[PDB]
A paper describes a structure:
The entry of the virus into host cells is facilitated by the S protein, which forms transmembrane homotrimers protruding from the viral surface. It consists of 2 functional subunits: S1 and S2. The S1 subunit includes the N-terminal domain (NTD) and the receptor-binding domain (RBD). The primary function of the S1 subunit is to attach to the key receptor, angiotensin-converting enzyme 2 (ACE2), on host cells.
Prior to our cryo-EM analyses of the binary complex structures, we used BLI to demonstrate that the S protein of BQ.1 exhibits the highest affinity for ACE2 compared with BA.1 and BA.2, from which BQ.1 is derived. To investigate the structural basis of the enhanced ACE2 binding by the S protein of BQ.1, we determined the cryo-EM structure of the S protein of BQ.1 in complex with ACE2. Compared with BA.1 and BA.2, BQ.1 carries an R493Q reversion, forming a bipartite hydrogen bonding network with H34 and E35 of ACE2. Unlike Q493 in BQ.1, R493 in BA.1 and BA.2 can form only a single hydrogen bond with E35 of ACE2. Furthermore, the interaction between R498 in BQ.1 and D38 of ACE2 involves a bidentate salt bridge, which was opposite from the monodentate mode observed in BA.1 and BA. This difference may also strengthen the interactions between BQ.1 and ACE2. In addition, the N501Y mutation is implicated in T-shaped π–π stacking with Y41 of ACE2. Several residues in the ACE2 contact region underwent substitutions to positively charged amino acids (N440K, T478K, Q498R, and Y505H), which are commonly observed among Omicron subvariants. Specific mutations (D405N and E484A) also enhance ACE2 interactions by reducing repulsive charges, and mutations K417N and S477N contribute to maintaining a suitable surface potential for ACE2 interactions. These modifications collectively augment ACE2 binding by increasing the positive electrostatic surface potential around the RBM, thereby strengthening its affinity toward the negatively charged RBD binding site of ACE2. While T444 is located distant from the RBM, the positively charged R452 of BQ.1 within the RBM positively contributes to ACE2 binding.
Numbering used by the authors:
A (entry chain C): 296 to 639
B (entry chain A): 739 to 885
C (entry chain A): 14 to 295
D (entry chain A): 935 to 1033
E (entry chain B): 985 to 1033
F (entry chain B): 739 to 787
The structure:
């Protein structure tokens, strides 16, 4: 099939790559398990104004997303750097929950790296925002028949706001010698404006609650983790593993590395994870992906014979039992049998 | 790596992988052909006489050393030491032939990144034996062994 | 009442190759990894604030509140009986949050609060025979404290040795920086032989704590304690005794650095890039 | 004594080693993608949206591999010219006397 | 940023093609220069048969 | 050009500039080698009588 012919001449042809497949899947987390304060975010009576966006810190918890499993009528789970359904498979550290109430149609103005008057003078999201935004209608609680003018936004500033920057300085920008004294006119413009939450305005212009969840991924010791079932680990066996969101396959042997107490990930010259600390018991284990290598077929001409030999390049003969050997397939003499005839 | 989705979408791209494999196989067989054309210029292996006296011309430092297991000449040993070594497929039961933990792991990391070095068809011992045959023919036969 | 008690005198010394610390908590071994971080540039100025504490003749203030710039590097040779913490803030008043770090002989307390105090912060301690253990009063030394927001308690950063050699060994290299929401504070304590200032050689500053605040700092100050023999009288010149409360200050700058991790995963060497053409070549 | 005596073969070895090191470092390059670790990308984004990011990574790494292979072909033509010179030198200087 | 990324890719590909063609014609120039050194040795520094 | 905004995006693509600059420097030193091998075949300068 590789040579695209029925007649194969005498030679060695690099046929494929053999990788000893994983045996089982083991998922690990720290033994401690706590209910994350995410519920308190959804149980909050009110959110701060957009000019003074509320910030909460989430850490040292297990991400219990049951709040969005059972009761999630939210209109947009507009995740950007991650998939909404993948949250259970990854752990986060130093999670930041920003929250405010804005107009529904202004979501396009809070896009990652978007530019706008609010995006320049109220709340600038970073151009490389790695997180999610959850917006849901708040007309039930954050709207009044007389007009909910309590929420106010900073309309104007001298300079554009930096990403993830909060400014509460209310100093007026007097462009002339005339003192403002609260008078709107020449060289005097107020930097704040009340929200136009008029009752006559329909949906979109109504208040909606927006929560921006910002995550920094795996470069720091993880503190927020998924609700997955913690299992046991095995040594010298190529298995799947999900260590606090770090997914991989290989063997996990005992490591004699002298990790410093603040260190979690060890890396080799190729800056890939060579060792990891078990989140349950703080001990260092060496990760080594299971054996693999090229597989070439040595054959005479098909005009002459049909028996073939197989070379597994650069692999110890203790990793041979895969589904080509006679011990794993039917005893057919076309290719190879008897178990013996192995040469290192 | 080991992701199936990336391989499937790589299949959608056509056959650059096949062309690259063909080019690298051509490069490897070209390396073997280069070694054969440079060193394997004689059918027979020629043995130096047991008594190595040639009128006073001392070839001890270029002739093979019967003492050391490598059988390389002292000059060959100096050249081997001067140049940085390379993997030679040692049997260490590491799963990837030669390897160690917390050591010179650049080759191990390269292997785990998919880059592999295949051994030459002629081992350094057999390359040294070919060179010894060439030197024996030059010393004993002259230029008449090449025609 | 606010009283200045220090004979602060500014001299200039060489920074050498001090101040090197760990960028992130990622184990690495036998790697010449290069980073781009704030660091104390090699062979820079050091404002050695050589001074004698407990000097009642310095009632008028004579010490400024040093700025923070892009990260203050600190060094000293004083025990917890002399130097007892650090202060950070933008305006150092009750309008902006002030960060106080106190190193008790039994623990360390880190607080973030709108503390109200003058530009002469100190902690007067003495164990009077009435109780054998006298606790300081916040309302006495400090004018006010409102809307406290953060609190942290741990083991002492100053494992001071009673010996004079150990006292000189107390090189509390406490690098303070605020990047990416992290107020990173590092530490070291070298058994190096006694000298006059930061010696030759190298020492990686292991990450002592990574406070999850990382707010900008405009001014930096050193918290000192009035050293006493615990038998001296009270408010008098024969009370707070004179003591050489010398403390050095340096400033960090953005810079590319070429590190060198050893077998044990510790930074054993480092070079600045823009120091001299040899450094750029390296 | 002199370390520069064997400069040519050491340069060949260093060229191969630095080409391999450049290939390895290309793995850490993001090429405009959200990350450079395939497992992290797959665990973060579902295939319908992760397809664009993994395609950008595939294009970047394929460009790196293609440039590596082309420069390997160029330096292999150089090595083949040098090996033809070496074969000619063994024929004319070792297997004979070249004038 | 997207447009600058596109322009960077285009100019980088142009530069990479320029460098590869310079490498190819530099191998050509190097072959010609090895021939010229051989001609200097055997025609100028000697008589070539 | 004279822009840091493009340079920040430029460094994202890795050590491609290192390879290109190394290739060009190798080409330049190879040109020096070519001239030296073609012309500098002697180390004594001879005066015309
Ligand atoms: C050893 C050392 O760095 N000394 C410097 C000195 O050269 C410089 O003139 C002075 C500036 O005030 O700062 C200090
Ligand atoms: C002949 O050659 C041997 C070594 O092969 C040497 O020992 C001997 O002295 C030689 N006899 C002569 C030169 O007469
Ligand atoms: C509490 O913190 C706020 C900053 O949000 C500050 O304005 C206020 O003065 C502090 N104290 C009190 C009593 O609110
Ligand atoms: C550093 O590692 C060496 C072995 O590589 C060991 O002998 C030594 O004790 C280690 N140093 C420390 C401080 O652990």
């Amino acid at each position: 099939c590789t040579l695209k012919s029925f007649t194969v001449e005498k030679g060695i042809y690099q046929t494929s790559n053999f990788r000893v497949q994983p045996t089982e899947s083991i998922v690990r987390f720290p033994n401690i398990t706590n209910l994350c304060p995410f519920d308190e975010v959804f149980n909050a009576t009110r959110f701060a104004s957009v000019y003074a966006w509320n910030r909460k810190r989430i850490s040292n918890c297990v991400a219990d997303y049951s709040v969005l499993y059972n009761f999630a009528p939210f209109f947009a789970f507009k995740c950007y750097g991650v998939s909404p359904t993948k949250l259970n498979d990854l752990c986060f550290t130093n999670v930041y929950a920003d929250s405010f109430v804005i107009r529904g149609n202004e979501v396009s103005q809070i896009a990652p790296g978007q530019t706008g008057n609010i995006a320049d003078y109220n709340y600038k999201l970073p151009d490389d925002f790695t997180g999610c935004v959850i917006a849901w209608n708040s007309n039930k609680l954050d709207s009044t028949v007389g007009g909910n003018y309590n929420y106010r936004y900073r309309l104007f500033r001298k300079s554009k706001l930096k990403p993830f920057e909060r400014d509460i300085s209310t100093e007026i920008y007097q462009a002339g010698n005339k003192p403002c004294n609260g008078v709107a006119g020449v060289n005097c413009y107020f930097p704040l404006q009340s929200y136009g939450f008029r009752p006559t305005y329909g949906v979109g212009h109504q208040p909606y609650r927006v929560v921006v969840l910002s995550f920094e991924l795996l470069h720091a010791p993880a503190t927020v983790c998924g609700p997955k079932k913690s299992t046991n680990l095995v040594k010298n066996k190529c298995v799947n593993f999900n260590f606090n969101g770090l997914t991989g396959t290989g063997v996990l042997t005992e490591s004699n590395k002298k990790f410093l107490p603040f260190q979690q990930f060890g890396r080799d010259i190729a800056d890939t994870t060579d060792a990891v600390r078990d989140p349950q018991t703080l001990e260092i284990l060496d990760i080594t992906p299971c054996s693999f290598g090229g597989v070439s077929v040595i054959t005479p001409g098909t005009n002459t014979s049909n028996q073939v030999a197989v070379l597994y390049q650069g692999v110890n003969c203790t990793e041979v039992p895969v589904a080509i050997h006679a011990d794993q397939l039917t005893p057919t003499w076309r290719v190879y049998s008897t178990g013996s005839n192995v040469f290192q | 790596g080991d992701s199936t989705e990336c391989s499937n979408l790589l299949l959608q791209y056509g056959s650059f992988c096949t062309q690259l494999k063909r080019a690298l196989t051509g490069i490897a067989v070209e390396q073997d052909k280069n070694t054969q054309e440079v060193f394997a210029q004689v059918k027979q292996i020629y043995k130096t006489p047991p008594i190595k006296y040639f009128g006073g011309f001392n070839f001890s430092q270029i002739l093979p050393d019967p003492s050391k297991p490598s059988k390389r000449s002292p000059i060959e040993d100096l050249l081997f030491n001067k140049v940085t070594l390379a993997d030679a497929g040692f049997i260490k039961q590491y799963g990837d032939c030669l390897g160690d933990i917390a050591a010179r792991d650049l080759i191990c990391a390269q292997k785990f990144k998919g880059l592999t070095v295949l051994p030459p068809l002629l081992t350094d011992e057999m390359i040294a034996q070919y060179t010894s045959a060439l030197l024996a023919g030059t010393i004993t036969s002259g230029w008449t062994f090449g025609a | 009442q606010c009283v200045n008690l220090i004979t602060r005198t500014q001299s200039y010394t060489n920074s050498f190759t001090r101040g090197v610390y760990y960028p992130d908590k990622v184990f690495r071994s036998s790697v010449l990894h290069s980073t781009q971080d704030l660091f104390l540039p090699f062979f820079s100025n050091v404002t050695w604030f050589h001074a004698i504490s407990g000097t009642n003749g310095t009632k008028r203030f004579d010490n400024p509140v040093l700025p923070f710039n892009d990260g203050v590097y600190f060094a000293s040779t004083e025990k917890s009986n002399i130097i007892r913490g650090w202060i950070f803030g933008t305006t150092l008043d009750s309008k902006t949050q002030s960060l106080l770090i106190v190193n008790n002989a039994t623990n360390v307390v880190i607080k973030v609060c709108e503390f109200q105090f003058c530009n002469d912060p100190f902690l007067d301690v003495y164990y009077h025979k009435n109780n054998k253990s006298w606790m300081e009063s916040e309302f006495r030394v400090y004018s006010s404290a409102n809307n406290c927001t953060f609190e942290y308690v741990s083991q002492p950063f100053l494992m001071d040795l009673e010996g004079k050699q150990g006292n000189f060994k107390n090189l509390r290299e406490f690098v303070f920086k605020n990047i990416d929401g992290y107020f990173k504070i590092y530490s070291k304590h070298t058994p190096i032989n006694l000298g006059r200032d930061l010696p030759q050689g190298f020492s990686a500053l292991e990450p002592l704590v990574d406070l999850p605040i990382g707010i900008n700092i405009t001014r930096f100050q050193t918290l000192l304690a009035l050293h006493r023999s615990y038998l001296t009288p009270g408010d008098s010149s024969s009370g707070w005794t004179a003591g050489a409360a010398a403390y050095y200050v340096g400033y960090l700058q953005p810079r590319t650095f070429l590190l060198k991790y050893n077998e044990n995963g510790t930074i054993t060497d480092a070079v600045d890039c823009a120091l001299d053409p040899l450094s750029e070549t390296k | 004594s002199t370390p520069s005596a064997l400069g040519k073969l050491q340069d060949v070895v260093n060229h191969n080693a630095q080409a391999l090191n450049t290939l390895v470092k290309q793995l850490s390059s993001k090429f405009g993608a959200i990350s450079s670790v395939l497992n992290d990308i797959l665990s973060r984004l579902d295939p319908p949206e992760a397809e664009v990011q993994i395609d950008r990574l595939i294009t970047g790494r394929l460009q790196s591999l293609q440039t590596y292979v082309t420069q390997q072909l160029i330096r292999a033509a150089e090595i083949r010219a040098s090996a033809n010179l070496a074969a000619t030198k063994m024929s004319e200087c070792v297997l004979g006397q070249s004038k």
